[PDB]
Amino acid sequence: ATADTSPERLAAIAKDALGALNDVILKHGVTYPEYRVFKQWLIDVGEGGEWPLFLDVFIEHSVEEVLARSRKGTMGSIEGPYYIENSPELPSKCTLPMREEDEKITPLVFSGQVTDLDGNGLAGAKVELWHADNDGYYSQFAPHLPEWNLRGTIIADEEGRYEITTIQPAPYQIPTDGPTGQFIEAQNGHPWRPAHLHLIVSAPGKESVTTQLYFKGGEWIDSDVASATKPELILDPKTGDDGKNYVTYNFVLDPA
Amino acid sequence: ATADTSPERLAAIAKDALGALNDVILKHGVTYPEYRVFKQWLIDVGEGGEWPLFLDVFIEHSVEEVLARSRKGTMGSIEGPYYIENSPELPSKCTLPMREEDEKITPLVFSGQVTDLDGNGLAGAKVELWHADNDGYYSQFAPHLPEWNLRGTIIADEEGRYEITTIQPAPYQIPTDGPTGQFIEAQNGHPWRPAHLHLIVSAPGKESVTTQLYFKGGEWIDSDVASATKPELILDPKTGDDGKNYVTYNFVLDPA
Numbered sequence: 001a002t003a004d005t006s007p008e009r010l011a012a013i014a015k016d017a018l019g020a021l022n023d024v025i026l027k028h029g030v031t032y033p034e035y036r037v038f039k040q041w042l043i044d045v046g047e048g049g050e051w052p053l054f055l056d057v058f059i060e061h062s063v064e065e066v067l068a069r070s071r072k073g074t075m076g077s078i079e080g081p082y083y084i085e086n087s088p089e090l091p092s093k094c095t096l097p098m099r100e101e102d103e104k105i106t107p108l109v110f111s112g113q114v115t116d117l118d119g120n121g122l123a124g125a126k127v128e129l130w131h132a133d134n135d136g137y138y139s140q141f142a143p144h145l146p147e148w149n150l151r152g153t154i155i156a157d158e159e160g161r162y163e164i165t166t167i168q169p170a171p172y173q174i175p176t177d178g179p180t181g182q183f184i185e186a187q188n189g190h191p192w193r194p195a196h197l198h199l200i201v202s203a204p205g206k207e208s209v210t211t212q213l214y215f216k217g218g219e220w221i222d223s224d225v226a227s228a229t230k231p232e233l234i235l236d237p238k239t240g241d242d243g244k245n246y247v248t249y250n251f252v253l254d255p256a
Numbered sequence: 257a258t259a260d261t262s263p264e265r266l267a268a269i270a271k272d273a274l275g276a277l278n279d280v281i282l283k284h285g286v287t288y289p290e291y292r293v294f295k296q297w298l299i300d301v302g303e304g305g306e307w308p309l310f311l312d313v314f315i316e317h318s319v320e321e322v323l324a325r326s327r328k329g330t331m332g333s334i335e336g337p338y339y340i341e342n343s344p345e346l347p348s349k350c351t352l353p354m355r356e357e358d359e360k361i362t363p364l365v366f367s368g369q370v371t372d373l374d375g376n377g378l379a380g381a382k383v384e385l386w387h388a389d390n391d392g393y394y395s396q397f398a399p400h401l402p403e404w405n406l407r408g409t410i411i412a413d414e415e416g417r418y419e420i421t422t423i424q425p426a427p428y429q430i431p432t433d434g435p436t437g438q439f440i441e442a443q444n445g446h447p448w449r450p451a452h453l454h455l456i457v458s459a460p461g462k463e464s465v466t467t468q469l470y471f472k473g474g475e476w477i478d479s480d481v482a483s484a485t486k487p488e489l490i491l492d493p494k495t496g497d498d499g500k501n502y503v504t505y506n507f508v509l510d511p512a
């Protein structure tokens with residue numbers, strides 16, 4: 001993991017970042033025992049392997065809001081800590097891999113097209129999709145799930161179209177028996193994310209987009225702990241006589 | 257380590273602390289690769305056991321500046337990460353324990369009196385003193401030093417007086433082959449603290465004071481990496497015909 005930040009730019013950032021915290025401490029009269037609690041918790045965050053968790057929930061949304069300033073395509077959202085590269089490729093119309101359990105849940109049928117800024121369809125286009133199962137678990141972040149449960153790389157057809165069938169995701173609770181959940185518990189917050197799909201959408205010559213989609217009227221949609229929900233990314237699926245939820249969303253990519 | 261911070265107070269703090277960082281990220285256009293570097297470094301800080309180091313150098317000075325608002329006695333300073341409780345008690349006039357190496361260094365003779373706000377001397381008074389040796393090492397933070405090298409608990413006499421002989425401390429470099437020094441290296445900073453003594457001064461019925469003392473004209477005194485030097489805490493020892501450095505400083509305690 002590298003950047004090419006200059007010492008001068010790190011110096012300006014660190015100074016107002018340290019200035020920032022130091023000013024909060026001064027504003028609220030943080031005490032020595034509060035300080036000691038804060039020191040222990042930071043240690044616990046690392047010992048709990050929760051730096052990705054904590055930072056993706058509480059910080060990454062500002063880093064996406066930066067990127068969002070230079071992009072004219074589909075709204076992005078945070079990646080979160082559960083992306084895995086190289087999920088198995090599937091054809092343009094496919095079902096995501098799932099367990100027999102998973103089949104008991106309302107299907108979600110997700111259609112659309114990857115296009116450029118003018119609205120031309122894109123051949124070569126990929127949709128990387130991943131989301132939690134109805135129990136709030138992600139494959140590879142839970143020993144009982146097949147390694148690619150509800151994960152996959154959809155190859156859009158020559159026109160950049162896809163029809164991907166999955167399960168309707170459910171509200172997901174972040175892990176809470178660790179320093180991150182203890183942090184939310186101690187301030188009477190809640191550890192919930194709205195139900196959501198995660199997606200990385202790509203095409204030759206295009207800048208990839210990392211995004212999420214949520215579901216209209218879904219719970220926690222206006223109080224996501226990760227502060228990652230945007231109005232533009234809320235789908236409103238219609239249910240068909242077959243009892244499957246159906247939705248169309250297209251992705252629009254900026255030039256790389 | 258506990259506090260009795262209310263959820264509401266944690267909520268107000270965390271909100272402007274997160275607001276703070278999130279605003280820095282927005283101000284400087286922090287990028288995804290910068291974000292990834294920052295995530296790794298945080299992990300490395302924990303894996304390097306450097307949370308006490310990092311926070312005592314870059315944050316604790318604001319927490320002392322809070323405490324400083326309610327105290328009328330001697331100026332405090334940060335504790336730093338190297339305090340050890342229960343250092344062996346010594347009499348009111350004593351030498352701090354040291355190695356044969358240590359004896360090659362100019363002695364420092366440190367005199368004074370612990371008093372209250374009105375200037376009455378204090379019986380029962382203790383000075384806990386600790387500092388680095390001429391090599392920049394602290395006992396118990398370096399496998400080659402005796403466990404109480406340059407550490408001790410001086411019992412002030414019935415009038416609250418002490419005459420403590422030690423070595424003249426030297427500028428201390430913080431550890432730099434870790435994530436904290438890498439953080440300072442990457443911004444073209446320097447990892448130096450001015451030469452200094454650490455002290456906890458106590459008396460029955462008094463609120464203890466944690467402080468540090470520095471040496472007039474000493475290097476890094478105006479650019480301490482820990483931002484912990486105060487003008488009030490700079491001593492100006494005089495050297496005697498015996499070639500020992502001599503200095504008088506008294507401590508004034510607030511009521512507990």
Ligand SMILES: Cc1cccc(O)c1O
Nearest residue numbers: 056057078080081226228
């Ligand atoms: C942003 C985010 C944070 C934690 C867990 C998740 O599933 C997620 O999407």
Ligand SMILES: Cc1cccc(O)c1O
Nearest residue numbers: 312313334336337482484
């Ligand atoms: C404040 C501080 C931080 C790091 C090392 C020290 O010796 C010290 O006094």
Ligand SMILES: [Fe+3]
Nearest residue numbers: 080082196198
């Ligand atoms: Fe998620």
Ligand SMILES: [Fe+3]
Nearest residue numbers: 336338452454
């Ligand atoms: Fe020190």
